[PDB]
Structure formats: structure tokens, C-alpha cells
Amino acid sequence: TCPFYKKIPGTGFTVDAFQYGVVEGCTAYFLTHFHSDHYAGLSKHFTFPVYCSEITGNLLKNKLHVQEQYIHPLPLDTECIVNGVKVVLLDANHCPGAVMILFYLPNGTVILHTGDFRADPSMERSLLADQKVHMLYLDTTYCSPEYTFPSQQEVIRFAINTAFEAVTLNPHALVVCGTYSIGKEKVFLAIADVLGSKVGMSQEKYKTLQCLNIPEINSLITTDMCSSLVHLLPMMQINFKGLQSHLKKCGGKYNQILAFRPTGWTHSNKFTRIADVIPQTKGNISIYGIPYSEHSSYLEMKRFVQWLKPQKIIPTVNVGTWKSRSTMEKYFREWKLEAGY
Numbered sequence: 001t002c003p004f005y006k007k008i009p010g011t012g013f014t015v016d017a018f019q020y021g022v023v024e025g026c027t028a029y030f031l032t033h034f035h036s037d038h039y040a041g042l043s044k045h046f047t048f049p050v051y052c053s054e055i056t057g058n059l060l061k062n063k064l065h066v067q068e069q070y071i072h073p074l075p076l077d078t079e080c081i082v083n084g085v086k087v088v089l090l091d092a093n094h095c096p097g098a099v100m101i102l103f104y105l106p107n108g109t110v111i112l113h114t115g116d117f118r119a120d121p122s123m124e125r126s127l128l129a130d131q132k133v134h135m136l137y138l139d140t141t142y143c144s145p146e147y148t149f150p151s152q153q154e155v156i157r158f159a160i161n162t163a164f165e166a167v168t169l170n171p172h173a174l175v176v177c178g179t180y181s182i183g184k185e186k187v188f189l190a191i192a193d194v195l196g197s198k199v200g201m202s203q204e205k206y207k208t209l210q211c212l213n214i215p216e217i218n219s220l221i222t223t224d225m226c227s228s229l230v231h232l233l234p235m236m237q238i239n240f241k242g243l244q245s246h247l248k249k250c251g252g253k254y255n256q257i258l259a260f261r262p263t264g265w266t267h268s269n270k271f272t273r274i275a276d277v278i279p280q281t282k283g284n285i286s287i288y289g290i291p292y293s294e295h296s297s298y299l300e301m302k303r304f305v306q307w308l309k310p311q312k313i314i315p316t317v318n319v320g321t322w323k324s325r326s327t328m329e330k331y332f333r334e335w336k337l338e339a340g341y
């Protein structure tokens with residue numbers, strides 16, 4: 001049964017609730033972004049409206065095969081009416097096409113659902129600046145002071161230099177980058193751009209990236225593995241046996257792989273900086289774990305909510321245990337007392 005934190009009161013709307021059947025009294029189904037936990041349940045056989053970004057729209061049509069008429073895309077930053085409710089979609093700074101949703105209820109209540117987001121100061125100068133928000137439905141994935149991690153530009157720098165070094169020392173070396181969803185494209189794009197290559201990948205992953213309205217994207221990727229020296233692979237495969245395997249496949253064209261695992265948080269963030277990272281090494285293969293997050297750090301979260309000063313916060317992540325819920329209420333209370341809202 002759809003949980004209360006996927007429902008929008010005084011509307012027929014649900015958010016990221018595709019996996020319970022027909023939720024009785026749901027006229028519309030909003031989807032924040034294309035990652036499987038949020039879209040779970042969708043197929044070609046859905047015949048209720050869906051609301052979403054143009055990009056998330058392109059992915060539903062071409063990857064899951066949802067019928068044209070049921071995908072309602074919306075422009076961002078645009079006051080839009082949807083069953084006589086003003087809504088606005090805002091960039092969530094998560095994976096491509098990912099949105100936060102502003103709901104303007106008839107009664108005068110204003111509600112922000114963040115989906116999955118990485119909060120940024122840029123968001124304080126958007127349409128949220130104009131007016132008050134009474135309820136915040138919040139991605140609490142890293143709501144605990146232990147969770148720090150570096151910025152996206154710090155991480156990308158590291159990655160660029162590392163690869164550009166190795167390939168300049170040994171030109172017969174191969175870069176590989178792991179991936180299992182959309183998101184974190186910048187890793188493999190920024191590397192490939194410093195190396196003067198296109199990114200090689202499967203057919204499936206090319207079809208996926210072709211949906212994302214990236215500029216000059218035809219010039220940046222290929223389905224030809226032979227003619228490229230930055231390859232993508234399923235994250236499952238990014239290990240010693242599975243790389244060696246793949247290193248056999250390329251046919252005596254490279255002698256050394258230098259791979260990247262873009263992780264989120266890991267426990268070594270508590271005891272090591274970005275400039276001081278090292279790889280595991282079984283011969284000619286070197287694997288780098290790098291903490292590139294598309295979710296908010298504890299502090300980024302904190303600042304956003306302290307600026308927004310919402311009247312009520314409702315967690316959408318790590319809600320499934322009482323200890324996690326209870327912990328999170330402490331931090332919401334600390335934030336509000338500190339800031340005087």
C-alpha cells in the first residue's frame with residue numbers, strides 16, 4: 001500500500017509511486033527522475049497520465065516503451081496547470097532530467113518535493129526565493145554529520161589529471177569507467193575530452209545516452225569499441241577477473257587498464273582526502289574508487305533547509321527503521337533551533 005510520504009494531500013497526485021497498482025484516488029503520477037527505485041512498475045501497459053521532464057519523458061518512450069499520449073513532459077522554471085493545480089518543476093542537480101516539484105494547493109498550502117537531489121546554493125536564486133513553503137518532502141539519504149564528501153569539480157579534476165597522466169606515460173593504456181544507471185556522465189565525458197577520444201559503450205548504453213539532450217552528443221560517444229580509448233562497463237564487471245577478461249577482448253591493442261569506480265560515500269571518506277587517493281593493483285590493472293555524489297552532503301542539506309525555513313519536513317529516504325527516523329528528527333530540530341524559524 002502506497003506510503004503517506006508518496007501522497008500529496010488535497011490533490012489526486014502521487015510522487016514516485018509506480019509499484020503498488022492503481023492507488024485509489026490518484027488522477028496523476030509524477031516521476032522525479034529515471035532511476036529504477038522511483039520508476040519501478042512502469043511498462044508499456046500503463047494508461048494513466050505521467051508527469052515528468054522532457055528528458056525523463058524521452059527515457060520512458062524509448063527505454064520502457066510507454067505510449068506517447070500518457071507521457072506529459074513539462075518545461076522547467078515554468079508556471080504550469082495540471083488538473084487545476086499550479087505546479088513548477090525545478091532542476092534537482094541529481095541525474096539527467098531529474099526534478100523537484102513545487103505544488104500550489106487550492107487552500108493556499110505550498111509544498112516542495114525534492115525527489116533525489118544534491119542541494120546547491122544556486123537553488124536559492126530560483127523560483128523558491130519568491131515565496132513561503134509550508135511542507136518539504138526531503139531526500140534524507142545523507143542526513144548524518146559523518147557524511148561529508150568533496151565537490152563534483154574537485155572530483156572531476158582528480159579524475160582528469162589521473163587518466164591524462166597515465167595515458168601520456170603509456171599510450172597503450174585503456175581507461176574504463178563503471179556505470180549502472182543514468183547519472184555521473186561528467187566522469188567519463190570529462191576524461192574522454194582530455195584524452196581526445198569518444199566514449200565507447202554497448203548499444204543499450206548508447207541508446208540511453210541518446211535520450212538525454214546533451215549538446216554535441218553525436219561527436220562525444222560511439223558504439224565502436226575499437227576506435228575509442230575510454231570504455232564504459234557495467235559496474236558489476238569492474239574488478240580484476242572481469243577487467244582481465246575485457247582486456248583479452250580488445251585484442252592486443254592495450255597493455256594496461258586504468259579504471260574508475262564512481263562510488264557515493266564510503267567509510268574511507270572519514271579518514272582520507274581527494275588529493276590522497278590510491279588504487280588497488282593486481283598487475284597491469286588499477287582500480288580507483290572516487291566519491292562522486294549526486295545526493296546532498298550533510299552540510300549542503302542543512303544550509304538548504306536553514307534557508308528554506310520550512311514549517312514541516314517529511315523524510316522520503318531511510319524511513320524504514322525507527323532508529324533512523326528518530327535520529328533524523330533530532331537533526332531537523334537542531335537546525336530549526338539554531339536558525340530561529
Ligand code: NI
Binds near residue numbers: 116
Ligand atoms: Ni536517484
